Structure 1
Amino acid sequence: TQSLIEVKNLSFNRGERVIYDNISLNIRRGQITAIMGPSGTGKTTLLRLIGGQLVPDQGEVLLDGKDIAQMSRQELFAARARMGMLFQSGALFTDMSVYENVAFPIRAHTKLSENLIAELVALKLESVGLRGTEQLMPTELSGGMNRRVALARAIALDPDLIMYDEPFAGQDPIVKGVLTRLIRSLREALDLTTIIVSHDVPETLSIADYIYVVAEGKIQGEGTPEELQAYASPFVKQFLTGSAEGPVEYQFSHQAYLDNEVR
């Protein structure tokens, strides 16, 4: 059960609230683990740390011993040439059309011949769900078509670790059923490593191998989906079915109104 990412204990305050305090995670090789949880955790702010964008303050991130932000800037771009990442509201390279957005990381990392460079260019777009909407401008597209094109360039190079960030946000129930196949069908076929951040409990539990639910700064529930629902702590039971019982800020001010002046 050897892992790729070995998070040691972390503290992190970029909004001066409580975020991620003394937490340690491990991502086993060849497993689709979903990092769900409520709104009380930085959006992908965990995944920025594995990217090495924001700084672990008392953290310690070990990428197989090779430490992020102890390494070189040359090796980090060699390290960031291991990952594909669909963003939150998918950052497309505006202006450049659909034929150039997915061919962007292909051309950035060619290592074969001229033909075999162009061979994989026409081969990826048939490999994804495409090759007939090549030259449309990233102007005519919606949230359902945003992440669809964005997923194509995320899987462009075969990675050793690939992250997804809410792909199921603009999809129809047919095409998200295709997408839930399209995520995992790559995973058994190419033995890669996925990390999904999302909140849609039905298909996420039926696709993951180890989901972690974090409330504000700490784990609420970890493990396979069998034992996780079987060992629901009274934050996990409230998060499953969705029963309206929880310590969230439903109203912020819990003061009076009769004795409250109205400026």
Structure 2
Amino acid sequence: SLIEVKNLSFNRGERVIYDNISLNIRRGQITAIMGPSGTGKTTLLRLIGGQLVPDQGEVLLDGKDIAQMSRQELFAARARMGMLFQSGALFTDMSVYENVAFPIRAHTKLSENLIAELVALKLESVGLRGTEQLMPTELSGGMNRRVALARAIALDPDLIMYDEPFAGQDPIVKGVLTRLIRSLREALDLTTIIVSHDVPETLSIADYIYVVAEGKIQGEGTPEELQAYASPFVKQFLTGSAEGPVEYQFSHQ
């Protein structure tokens, strides 16, 4: 569904990270967020309607304010989200089978036979069929990400958030993750959010991009449009040029 965030303001550690952010997450589309590191990218996603509490503004799911409205709905509503947090988390004390199975037990009451079959299907969707009994700690890095993703899509959620999936990796893996996103956005009718520093990849994936820095949106558009509005900040940011509104510390004497 559509997600709207309006007039968002949030202060952490006595500093404002966000100041009147206004976002429109378009249904069935890939929405992406780009910007300098260390400026709230994870935080902004958490404030989408996760565990963080804004000081001002509203979060709307299907147009409804999630704050207060109600306990049971919200519990169930939570079943509509899946996420990869930073490096991606796997529980170390659980087998791969259990890591994918886990969220199922938060909302359903199924027979062992059916929970097992769902895990098998979800692991095959990311190329992991047959790795169920290995402990996750014994996997290579490429597989750790794929296992975590299988968990994220385990409940047939509508929204998948990838928190910095392209930040630092192997070019082979980048090829695979790109393909999984393309495959899944269609196969599951998903709305997705990609938040990433590696501008060249984001630019060819997202349908719509926001550029966020210093707590404010500093330009928005499809990648074609962002290139048309060369505010010095956005232009330097999206090109990698070392010239623009950045600083060095010197004065001769």
Q: TM-score, normalised by structure 2?
A: 0.89
Q: Secondary structure at the match of 1:111?
A: coil
Cα deviation, 1:202-229, whole Å, max 9, x if unaligned, reads: 2211110111111111112211111111
Structure with greater proportional helix content: 2
| Structure 1, unpaired ranges of 5+ | 256-263
Number of equivalent positions = 253
Distance 1:36 1:252, change over 3 A: farther
Distance 1:114 1:91, change over 3 A: closer
Q: Give 1:75 shift.
A: 2.2
Bigger shift: residues 62-71 or 19-28: 62-71
Distance 1:188 1:105, change over 3 A: same
Name the CA distance, whole Å, in 2 between partners of 1:102 and 1:249: 46
Contact 1:40 1:216 in 2 (8 A): no
Distance 1:233 1:186, change over 3 A: same
Name the CA distance, whole Å, in 1 between partners of 2:131 and 2:28: 32
Q: Secondary structure at the match of 1:44?
A: helix
Q: Give 1:246 shift.
A: 4.2
Query: Among residues 23, 26, 34, which one is paired with 1:25 in the alignment?
Result: 23
Name the CA distance, whole Å, in 1 between partners of 2:60 and 2:21: 14
Task: Report the equivalent of 2:94.
Answer: 96
Q: Give 1:154 shift.
A: 1.1
Cα deviation, 1:36-89, whole Å, max 9, x if unaligned, reads: 111252241111111331111111111123212222333222121110011112
Contact 2:9 2:55 in 1 (8 A): yes
Q: Give 1:170 shift.
A: 4.7
Distance 1:147 1:254, change over 3 A: farther
Contact 1:144 1:169 in 2 (8 A): no
Contact 1:32 1:209 in 2 (8 A): yes
Task: Report the equivalent of 2:57.
Answer: 59
Q: Secondary structure at the match of 2:2?
A: strand
Contact 1:9 1:24 in 2 (8 A): yes
Distance 1:210 1:172, change over 3 A: same
Q: Give 1:139 shift.
A: 2.5
Q: Secondary structure at the match of 2:194?
A: strand
Deviant stretches of 4+, over 6 Å: 252-255
Distance 1:189 1:137, change over 3 A: closer
Structure with greater proportional strand content: 2
Bigger shift: residues 41-50 or 111-120: 111-120
Task: Report the equivalent of 1:258.
Answer: none
Bigger shift: residues 39-48 or 159-168: 39-48
Contact 1:213 1:220 in 2 (8 A): yes
Cα deviation, 1:15-41, whole Å, max 9, x if unaligned, reads: 323321112111010101111111252
Distance 1:209 1:94, change over 3 A: same
Task: Report the equivalent of 2:211.
Answer: 213
Name the CA distance, whole Å, in 2 between partners of 1:235 and 1:224: 17
Q: Secondary structure at the match of 1:13?
A: strand
Percent identity over paired residues: 100
| Structure 2, unpaired ranges of 5+ | none
Q: Give 1:249 shift.
A: 6.2
Query: Among residues 70, 73, 96, which one is paired with 1:72 in the alignment?
Result: 70
Query: Among residues 136, 142, 156, which one is paired with 2:140 in the alignment?
Result: 142
Bigger shift: residues 199-208 or 103-112: 103-112
Q: Give 1:241 shift.
A: 2.2
Name the CA distance, whole Å, in 2 between partners of 1:132 and 1:184: 23
Contact 1:10 1:59 in 2 (8 A): yes
Cα deviation, 1:72-123, whole Å, max 9, x if unaligned, reads: 3332221211100111122222210111101212344446665443332222
Bigger shift: residues 132-141 or 206-215: 132-141
Q: TM-score, normalised by structure 1?
A: 0.86
CA RMSD of aligned residues (A): 2.6
